[PDB]
Symmetry: D2
Subunit: 293 residues, 4 copies
Amino acid sequence: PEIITPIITPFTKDNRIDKEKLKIHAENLIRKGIDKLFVNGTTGLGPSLSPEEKLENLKAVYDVTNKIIFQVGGLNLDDAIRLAKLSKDFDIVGIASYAPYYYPRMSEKHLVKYFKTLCEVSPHPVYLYNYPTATGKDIDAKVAKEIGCFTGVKDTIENIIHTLDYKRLNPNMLVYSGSDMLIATVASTGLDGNVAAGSNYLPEVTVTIKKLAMERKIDEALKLQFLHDEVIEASRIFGSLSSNYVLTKYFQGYDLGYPRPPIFPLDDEEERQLIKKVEGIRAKLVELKILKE
Amino acid sequence: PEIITPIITPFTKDNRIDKEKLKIHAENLIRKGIDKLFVNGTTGLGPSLSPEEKLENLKAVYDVTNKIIFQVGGLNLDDAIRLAKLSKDFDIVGIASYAPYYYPRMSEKHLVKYFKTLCEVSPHPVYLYNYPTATGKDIDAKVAKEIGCFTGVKDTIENIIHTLDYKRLNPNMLVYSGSDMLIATVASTGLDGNVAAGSNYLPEVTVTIKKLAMERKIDEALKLQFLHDEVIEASRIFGSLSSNYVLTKYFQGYDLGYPRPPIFPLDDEEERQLIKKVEGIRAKLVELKILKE
Amino acid sequence: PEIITPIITPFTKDNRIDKEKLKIHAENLIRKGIDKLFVNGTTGLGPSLSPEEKLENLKAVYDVTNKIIFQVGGLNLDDAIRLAKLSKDFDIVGIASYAPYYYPRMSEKHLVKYFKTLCEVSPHPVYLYNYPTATGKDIDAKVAKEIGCFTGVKDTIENIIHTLDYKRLNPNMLVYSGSDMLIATVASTGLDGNVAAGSNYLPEVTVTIKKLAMERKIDEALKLQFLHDEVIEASRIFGSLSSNYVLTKYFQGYDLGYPRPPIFPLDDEEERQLIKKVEGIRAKLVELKILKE
Amino acid sequence: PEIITPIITPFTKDNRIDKEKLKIHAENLIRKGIDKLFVNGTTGLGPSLSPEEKLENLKAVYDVTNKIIFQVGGLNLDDAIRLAKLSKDFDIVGIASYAPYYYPRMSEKHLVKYFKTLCEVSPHPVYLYNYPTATGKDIDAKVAKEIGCFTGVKDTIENIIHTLDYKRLNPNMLVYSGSDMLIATVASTGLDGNVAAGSNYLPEVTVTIKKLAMERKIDEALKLQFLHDEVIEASRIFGSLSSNYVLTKYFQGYDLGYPRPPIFPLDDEEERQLIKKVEGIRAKLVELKILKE
Ligand SMILES: *[C@H](C[C@@H](O)[C@H](O)CO)C(=O)O
Ligand SMILES: *[C@H](C[C@@H](O)[C@H](O)CO)C(=O)O
Ligand SMILES: *[C@H](C[C@@H](O)[C@H](O)CO)C(=O)O
Ligand SMILES: *[C@H](C[C@@H](O)[C@H](O)CO)C(=O)O
């Protein structure tokens, strides 16, 4: 199995993509053994990016690596098709899309048509990004089978049964969990990996959890997974999408600029409190020789 | 109380806004007694429109009427602030925003800051558009009170206790329901009216339900409410946002062109089936003299 | 419309039904204008009562009045059938049942069969007690129409559209809301009234809201409704089912003993904090001549 | 890890526990390698049993084996305390209770007091039976740690993150999943096993999935797991609790009498339809040499 980073998008103070900070971060993740980078995902604030910015993201990360899954979805299908066709000049892993978000009670037929249209024009393997809480709908294993053109799925859902069902109904699909908390479990249970937000700031940890679980050192894998869980839980206290910037700076030592409001940056007080929640974790990890310091 | 229409955005064959069809629609709604027009709401596919398109909708409806509430929200706060500021040269009723959508678990603090930021730049009264199912969050009467700058609220939720609470905790706030099914009830219970999708295609019916209920003719109000409910129900069979186009053309006589995919237009068969579902209702309305042939 | 009290079951210090306190409570409620008494409901802890105790409650209240709806439901259909049959000797208004609770994913067919079975043996009219949150399932207007034998429904749900649908699909059904917060609304919108827990402790308030709404004094009805809402809200701080005992003693001046654990009695400090929350409301109601003192 | 059966309670034609059928079934389960029996759980219709019947289930099963976890919970705490104290004369593994069901919004404090009360009187290790969908309450890993006295937990929820958290926050607790679909995953990931309704009718399948998983034959384990998933899905067509009876008779060759209505028995046609849905699975299991014939 693989660890895939849904890469954070660094913004400048005037709310443009900071390409140079993105490249440093992408270069670091690849050097620390991350397999592939999922670009314009939730963690990257994809829904907050215009189609031009989605492409800008791809071009900057492509300067560093071709190991990219390029997320192109949105609520203007013409724009998503355009992005899908534009990726033809990039030798990347795949494109991806979440389901059309916001609008409740879209028909199965319309959802299947949305995705089949993207598969039709795609010059690369297409990945389903299934995220029911964020999008308001579920594209489960049976609807994925019906659409029939997915090379893989990232399933972000608190239900590993649902994730396993993609493998059960679609044995040749790549099946990833969108959860940082399930690296050990996914690797132990025959699933294909994790698209793990926390791999942005602790890539060392997520790679080691997966490696321990593969060696069948499950007790050791769980011990490290449970420490990683505590960092995930701390990030959620003030808002994980904002906190991910602060933790990256903290653990990896470079900054990633700002998020895009209404994803507001943490303020000084929040930042102090987040750091006190994780500094003792940061100490144990150095002690275990997972972090240099 | 008032009936406000969240006006449909008509799109051309090549996916631009049909300004001229929009004006025709807006004019008919106003001539048939609709009090105000909510522009760029859900029914108008506001989340599917770029900022520039949200501005085109306003300019187009503004040619017809100034009775406008202008929805400006999105996931790029700089753009929302820019729209809010641009509305200064339009003598309209107010601007509005739904909560930032897609991203789950945004803190109350961030949500409050988002809306306070809009109020601080707005040259017009601000309306809260609360739609928990679509946006993934709830800006309830308590949180609305804390934000403290709303002139009104549109509450799309089936729970009328929640809606009544806005008036309870904010005695001066204008409080509308986002339901077509609650016109008689809202008018009967001391609330300010309804922002009703179905008033796009049946403005006569929604205005008459309201009038009947105002005259304490609740049995007759409910009878007409219950017929309207059947049309709402029919529009959900193939998807309401798509179905609204077909119903407007059927009941009002002119077309509103296409929705924007992934809100796909009904096909010929679906259109025929939908009409069969509402045929008997159109006949009953004609015979009650609510509609003419 | 009516106010119907789901009457509290007072337990002794040794956890038996206090028959005498129950008779004192029921006499008072009838004296204060309550229309009918709903026995073994949620407020009366019906699910915590054996079938023998559900019969004792009926016997005790029946000393006081024949204006009773006798709730008989549970997870042993043979006991429910036996309670329904034994009600033949009581000249009461009707029997009732919630849907079989606890077990999730019960089929429509099995649910319909449960209610038809009680209707087949009942010597009295049968009321549906619909409470999806408590029981895990919803017996909606269409399912009720299918069952075909209900005289009325108590709908405890946060969605008045759902409650109105009963009236729409079953024009001759008596349709009650299970909320205290919807008394003014229900009476304003042509529904049949409320089965209101809060009428245990403020019967005078619930009757007055209803009367004001009936007289089309909706602003006065709402002012009083909103006051009552605050009491309901206070009652939820330490748990409504427990707090209802304390409020009844405080507002009505007699004791109703204890709830049955695990519905634990409030402790002294909770009771003191509760009263602190509603003491100013009591003063208002006294000043308004709604309560005597 | 272990497979524990939440054993079905067979009822006679006249709705009494059929002790001799229960003993035959219990004996067969143990003989087929099941580790322990969980008595009066959901699958055994514990909420449909009086305290006396719960105790009757214990005595009949105790005739066969002492490998019993005795479920005692209910909405009369005195009756639960009684069952707990009565279990003193049985040399069994532990007692268990689900949370108080039906009543929504019970306070954490009241939930904690309920379990601690049971723990203070228990003469055996106490197991938490956590089942949020059935009971309306979650007793998560943090609330379990707060109660402090649980030797183990059965977590019936699809979200394995939640189940792993028990282990993370209570390293000495036995942690079981209540899912049949997670047997291979649970065993693979360092958890203590599964309390699996489907082990009543296919104990051989569930034990073999676990054994294969333990051997790190994950692909083999998943292939069997996936067949077992199909039987679980088949059982849900007409209602799993009722279907479980028909499936046990079909696969194990003896019958289990009747469930207790409103858990209604499948009729002749439903049984034939259910058999046709699992027939081809049986043949696959025969070909895999899991079953004879
Ligand atoms: C993939 C992971 C997401 O699904 C997280 O659950 C969002 O917090 C991604 O970030 O693109
Ligand atoms: C106004 C009402 C909405 O909340 C409806 O649910 C969509 O039809 C709007 O269109 O924004
Ligand atoms: C009727 C009203 C209920 O549904 C409340 O939720 C419980 O206080 C009743 O008490 O039975
Ligand atoms: C244990 C397993 C349950 O929790 C199932 O979820 C019921 O569907 C049991 O049957 O006691």
